[PDB]
Design a protein around this motif. Structure first.
Motif, PDB file in Angstrom:
ATOM      1  N   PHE A 304       0.911  -1.199  -0.001  1.00  0.00           N
ATOM      2  CA  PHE A 304      -0.044  -0.019  -0.053  1.00  0.00           C
ATOM      3  C   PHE A 304       0.911   1.391  -0.122  1.00  0.00           C
ATOM      4  CE2 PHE A 304      -2.278   3.495   2.377  1.00  0.00           C
ATOM      5  CZ  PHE A 304      -3.371   3.604   1.449  1.00  0.00           C
ATOM      6  N   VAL A 305       1.846   1.516   0.886  1.00  0.00           N
ATOM      7  CA  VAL A 305       2.708   2.494   1.057  1.00  0.00           C
ATOM      8  C   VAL A 305       3.586   2.713  -0.293  1.00  0.00           C
ATOM      9  CG1 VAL A 305       4.555   3.504   2.377  1.00  0.00           C
ATOM     10  CG2 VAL A 305       2.682   2.412   3.623  1.00  0.00           C
ATOM     11  N   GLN A 306       4.089   1.492  -0.941  1.00  0.00           N
ATOM     12  CA  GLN A 306       5.057   1.673  -2.152  1.00  0.00           C
ATOM     13  C   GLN A 306       4.258   2.004  -3.242  1.00  0.00           C
ATOM     14  OE1 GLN A 306       6.982  -2.466  -1.771  1.00  0.00           O
ATOM     15  NE2 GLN A 306       9.057  -1.240  -1.555  1.00  0.00           N
ATOM     16  N   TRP A 307       2.921   1.748  -3.317  1.00  0.00           N
ATOM     17  CA  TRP A 307       1.844   2.097  -4.092  1.00  0.00           C
ATOM     18  C   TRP A 307       1.704   3.724  -4.108  1.00  0.00           C
ATOM     19  CZ3 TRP A 307      -3.209   4.002  -3.902  1.00  0.00           C
ATOM     20  CH2 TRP A 307      -3.725   4.423  -4.691  1.00  0.00           C
ATOM     21  N   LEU A 308       1.374   4.041  -2.825  1.00  0.00           N
ATOM     22  CA  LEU A 308       0.951   5.411  -2.858  1.00  0.00           C
ATOM     23  C   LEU A 308       1.841   6.580  -2.683  1.00  0.00           C
ATOM     24  CD1 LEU A 308      -1.753   6.913  -1.785  1.00  0.00           C
ATOM     25  CD2 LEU A 308      -0.826   6.993   0.439  1.00  0.00           C
ATOM     26  N   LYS A 309       3.328   6.169  -2.618  1.00  0.00           N
ATOM     27  CA  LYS A 309       4.341   6.726  -2.536  1.00  0.00           C
ATOM     28  C   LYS A 309       4.269   8.332  -1.711  1.00  0.00           C
ATOM     29  CE  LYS A 309       6.012   4.861  -6.688  1.00  0.00           C
ATOM     30  NZ  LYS A 309       5.085   3.675  -6.973  1.00  0.00           N
ATOM     31  N   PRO A 310       3.956   8.225  -0.633  1.00  0.00           N
ATOM     32  CA  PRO A 310       3.816   9.550   0.132  1.00  0.00           C
ATOM     33  C   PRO A 310       5.235  10.252   0.354  1.00  0.00           C
ATOM     34  CG  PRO A 310       3.633   7.751   1.800  1.00  0.00           C
ATOM     35  CD  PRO A 310       3.884   6.979   0.219  1.00  0.00           C
ATOM     36  N   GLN A 311       5.171  11.631   0.468  1.00  0.00           N
ATOM     37  CA  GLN A 311       6.303  12.370   0.623  1.00  0.00           C
ATOM     38  C   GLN A 311       6.645  12.034   2.366  1.00  0.00           C
ATOM     39  OE1 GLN A 311       5.878  16.295  -0.884  1.00  0.00           O
ATOM     40  NE2 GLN A 311       5.964  15.608  -3.200  1.00  0.00           N
ATOM     41  N   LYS A 312       5.807  12.121   3.045  1.00  0.00           N
ATOM     42  CA  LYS A 312       6.040  12.000   4.462  1.00  0.00           C
ATOM     43  C   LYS A 312       5.135  10.984   5.154  1.00  0.00           C
ATOM     44  N   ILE A 313       5.443  10.407   6.099  1.00  0.00           N
ATOM     45  CA  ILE A 313       4.619   9.229   6.987  1.00  0.00           C
ATOM     46  C   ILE A 313       4.605   9.557   8.235  1.00  0.00           C
ATOM     47  CG2 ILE A 313       4.309   6.859   7.450  1.00  0.00           C
ATOM     48  CD1 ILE A 313       6.015   6.221   4.862  1.00  0.00           C
ATOM     49  N   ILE A 314       3.545   9.688   9.157  1.00  0.00           N
ATOM     50  CA  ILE A 314       3.635   9.916  10.330  1.00  0.00           C
ATOM     51  C   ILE A 314       2.707   8.744  10.957  1.00  0.00           C
ATOM     52  CG2 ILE A 314       2.395  11.284  12.174  1.00  0.00           C
ATOM     53  CD1 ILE A 314       2.463  13.740  10.167  1.00  0.00           C
ATOM     54  N   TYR A 331      12.107   0.573   8.281  1.00  0.00           N
ATOM     55  CA  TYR A 331      11.431   0.093   7.298  1.00  0.00           C
ATOM     56  C   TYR A 331      10.802   1.062   6.145  1.00  0.00           C
ATOM     57  CZ  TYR A 331      11.890  -4.423   9.924  1.00  0.00           C
ATOM     58  OH  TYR A 331      12.322  -5.547  10.426  1.00  0.00           O
ATOM     59  N   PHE A 332      10.303   2.198   6.620  1.00  0.00           N
ATOM     60  CA  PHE A 332       9.945   3.232   5.528  1.00  0.00           C
ATOM     61  C   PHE A 332      11.072   3.580   4.718  1.00  0.00           C
ATOM     62  CE2 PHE A 332       6.926   5.196   9.369  1.00  0.00           C
ATOM     63  CZ  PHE A 332       6.291   4.012   9.438  1.00  0.00           C
ATOM     64  N   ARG A 333      12.352   3.530   5.113  1.00  0.00           N
ATOM     65  CA  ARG A 333      13.613   3.922   4.437  1.00  0.00           C
ATOM     66  C   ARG A 333      13.939   2.837   3.471  1.00  0.00           C
ATOM     67  NH1 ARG A 333      14.971   8.967   2.257  1.00  0.00           N
ATOM     68  NH2 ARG A 333      13.827   9.556   4.218  1.00  0.00           N
ATOM     69  N   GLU A 334      13.788   1.754   3.986  1.00  0.00           N
ATOM     70  CA  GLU A 334      13.700   0.495   3.084  1.00  0.00           C
ATOM     71  C   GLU A 334      12.957   0.536   1.960  1.00  0.00           C
ATOM     72  OE1 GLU A 334      13.852  -3.407   4.983  1.00  0.00           O
ATOM     73  OE2 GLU A 334      15.172  -2.754   6.948  1.00  0.00           O
ATOM     74  N   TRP A 335      11.664   0.673   2.069  1.00  0.00           N
ATOM     75  CA  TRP A 335      10.568   0.589   1.077  1.00  0.00           C
ATOM     76  C   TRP A 335      10.854   1.796   0.015  1.00  0.00           C
ATOM     77  CZ3 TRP A 335       5.447   0.515   4.922  1.00  0.00           C
ATOM     78  CH2 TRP A 335       5.512  -0.326   5.906  1.00  0.00           C
ATOM     79  N   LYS A 336      11.139   2.825   0.394  1.00  0.00           N
ATOM     80  CA  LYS A 336      11.375   4.043  -0.451  1.00  0.00           C
ATOM     81  C   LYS A 336      12.391   3.699  -1.417  1.00  0.00           C
ATOM     82  CE  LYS A 336      12.933   8.746  -0.447  1.00  0.00           C
ATOM     83  NZ  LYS A 336      12.538  10.196   0.095  1.00  0.00           N
ATOM     84  N   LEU A 337      13.751   3.064  -0.803  1.00  0.00           N
ATOM     85  CA  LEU A 337      14.796   2.869  -1.539  1.00  0.00           C
ATOM     86  C   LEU A 337      14.731   1.482  -2.387  1.00  0.00           C
ATOM     87  CD1 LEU A 337      17.552   3.524   1.290  1.00  0.00           C
ATOM     88  CD2 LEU A 337      17.309   4.732  -0.628  1.00  0.00           C
ATOM     89  N   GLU A 338      13.780   0.489  -2.039  1.00  0.00           N
ATOM     90  CA  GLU A 338      13.548  -0.683  -2.883  1.00  0.00           C
ATOM     91  C   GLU A 338      12.923  -0.079  -4.242  1.00  0.00           C
ATOM     92  OE1 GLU A 338      11.000  -4.510  -3.650  1.00  0.00           O
ATOM     93  OE2 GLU A 338      10.865  -3.494  -1.555  1.00  0.00           O
ATOM     94  N   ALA A 339      11.993   0.890  -4.092  1.00  0.00           N
ATOM     95  CA  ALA A 339      11.323   1.423  -5.439  1.00  0.00           C
ATOM     96  C   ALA A 339      12.278   2.436  -6.371  1.00  0.00           C
ATOM     97  CB  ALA A 339      10.112   1.872  -4.862  1.00  0.00           C
ATOM     98  N   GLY A 340      13.302   2.571  -5.804  1.00  0.00           N
ATOM     99  CA  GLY A 340      14.273   3.617  -6.624  1.00  0.00           C
ATOM    100  C   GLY A 340      14.224   5.139  -6.331  1.00  0.00           C
ATOM    101  N   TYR A 341      13.507   5.460  -5.074  1.00  0.00           N
ATOM    102  CA  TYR A 341      13.372   6.736  -4.632  1.00  0.00           C
ATOM    103  C   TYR A 341      14.202   7.280  -3.425  1.00  0.00           C
ATOM    104  CZ  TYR A 341       8.728   7.605  -7.017  1.00  0.00           C
ATOM    105  OH  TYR A 341       7.787   7.867  -8.047  1.00  0.00           O
TER     106      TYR A 341
HETATM  107  C1  LIG Z   1      10.595  10.200   3.626  1.00  0.00           C
HETATM  108  O1  LIG Z   1       9.573   9.387   4.413  1.00  0.00           O
HETATM  109  C2  LIG Z   1       8.560   8.993   3.389  1.00  0.00           C
HETATM  110  C3  LIG Z   1       8.925   8.010   2.302  1.00  0.00           C
HETATM  111  O2  LIG Z   1       9.852   7.257   2.825  1.00  0.00           O
HETATM  112  N1  LIG Z   1       7.837   7.695   1.427  1.00  0.00           N
HETATM  113  C4  LIG Z   1       8.142   6.845   0.310  1.00  0.00           C
HETATM  114  C5  LIG Z   1       7.986   5.400   0.515  1.00  0.00           C
HETATM  115  C6  LIG Z   1       7.831   5.039   2.061  1.00  0.00           C
HETATM  116  C7  LIG Z   1       8.143   4.668  -0.500  1.00  0.00           C
HETATM  117  C8  LIG Z   1       8.075   4.843  -2.059  1.00  0.00           C
HETATM  118  C9  LIG Z   1       8.178   3.892  -2.978  1.00  0.00           C
HETATM  119  C10 LIG Z   1       7.972   6.085  -2.132  1.00  0.00           C
HETATM  120  C11 LIG Z   1       7.872   7.317  -0.946  1.00  0.00           C
HETATM  121  C12 LIG Z   1       7.940   8.523  -1.164  1.00  0.00           C
END
Ligand SMILES: COCC(=O)Nc1c(C)cc(C)cc1C
Ligand code: NI
Length: 341
Positions: A304-314, A331-341
């Motif tokens: 859900f989070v990797q689909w939505l791609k939010p700029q900030k999570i609370i 975990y949030f940083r892992e999820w971001k970096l796995e998608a290439g962001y």
């Molecule tokens: C900076 O914190 C928020 C964040 O990391 N968000 C985020 C995540 C979690 C996953 C993806 C694929 C993209 C984004 C922008």
């Protein structure tokens, strides 16, 4: 002191913040769902506007006696204006009447508050698909990879099959299901449906279920315990003493109890499959703990989070310890970096 994570910046709004008295500068109080950790503080003496789903509003009026003039129910999936701000309520796949809330701020920021939710791919085709979301207030209850559980469908299959087998083998067996709040109604309704019975329960619990607008509910629930072979009891009574006592009260109609406790997560799930679940047994009483969850698994939350791609999570759950907070942020940083962001 209302915590920052229950406040929506750039508005007069709070979410699930009824236990703090009058919150400074709050012009409208939102309630995501009728669970006590979220509604704590509402009563007949509350005189600020409350915004919620129709089902939650029915419960506020009838169970807590909040005056109609202060209840503001909103339809789902519909753009509404509240104190000059556009809002949308979305189905949260939690308990009946539970919603997520989209806020469209005057400056162009878009905020999603999930309330309590069980993430599902069906959410990817709601009104969420139609714009970018900048800030996500996230139900992080099970935000750790050890939290795996089966689908709700697999768990109901197990419960139906178990109950049907037990009662077909012994027609004098009683089935009992535990409850302490709304949610997980499918457990007891699906069992009653396979056995051709209604679910018997207290007057107070029957009142609560009548508030939900569930279709054909008069057809599946009753206060007449004598005509029912599926009984609902408080979760506190689902133990060998409580169940022995209940059997005594049924006056020789029954000689065996099969009971279900529909808890969120057990640590059987780490080493076991749903098909491999076994009960605790003492004499003529068996108790099954079944992993029926109304919160996201770790993998469901991640997707859900990797689909939505939010700029900030609370995060809104597990916020009280530094160890939990640090773990979730990693975990949030892992999820971001796995998608290439
Ligand atoms: C900076 O914190 C928020 C964040 O990391 N968000 C985020 C995540 C979690 C996953 C993806 C694929 C993209 C984004 C922008
Ligand atoms: Ni809840």
């Amino acid at each position: 002191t209302c915590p920052f994570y229950k406040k929506i910046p750039g508005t007069g709004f709070t979410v699930d913040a009824f236990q703090y008295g009058v919150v400074e500068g709050c012009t409208a109080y939102f309630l995501t769902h009728f669970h006590s950790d979220h509604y704590a503080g509402l009563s007949k003496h509350f005189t600020f506007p409350v915004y919620c789903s129709e089902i939650t509003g029915n419960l506020l009026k009838n169970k807590l006696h909040v005056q109609e003039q202060y209840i503001h129910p909103l339809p789902l999936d519909t753009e509404c204006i509240v104190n000059g701000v556009k809002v949308v309520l979305l189905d949260a796949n939690h308990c009946p009447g539970a919603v997520m809330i989209l806020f469209y701020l005057p400056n162009g920021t878009v905020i999603l508050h999930t309330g309590d939710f069980r993430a599902d791919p069906s959410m990817e085709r709601s009104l969420l698909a139609d714009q970018k979301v900048h800030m996500l207030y996230l139900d992080t209850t099970y935000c750790s990879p050890e939290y795996t559980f089966p689908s709700q469908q697999e768990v109901i299959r197990f419960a139906i099959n178990t109950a049907f087998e037990a009662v077909t083998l012994n027609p004098h067996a009683l089935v009992v299901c535990g409850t302490y709040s709304i949610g997980k109604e499918k457990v007891f309704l699906a069992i009653a449906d396979v056995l051709g019975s209604k679910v018997g329960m207290s007057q107070e619990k029957y009142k609560t279920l009548q508030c939900l607008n569930i279709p054909e509910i008069n057809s599946l629930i009753t206060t007449d315990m004598c005509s029912s072979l599926v009984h609902l009891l408080p979760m506190m009574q689902i133990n060998f003493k409580g169940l022995q006592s209940h059997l005594k009260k049924c006056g020789g109609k029954y000689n065996q109890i099969l009971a279900f406790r529909p808890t969120g997560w057990t640590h059987s799930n780490k080493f076991t499959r749903i098909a491999d679940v076994i009960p605790q047994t003492k004499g003529n009483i068996s108790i099954y703990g079944i992993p029926y969850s109304e919160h996201s698994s770790y993998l469901e939350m991640k997707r859900f989070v990797q689909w939505l791609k939010p700029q900030k999570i609370i995060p809104t759950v597990n916020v009280g310890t530094w160890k939990s907070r640090s773990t979730m942020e990693k975990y949030f940083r892992e999820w971001k970096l796995e998608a290439g962001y």
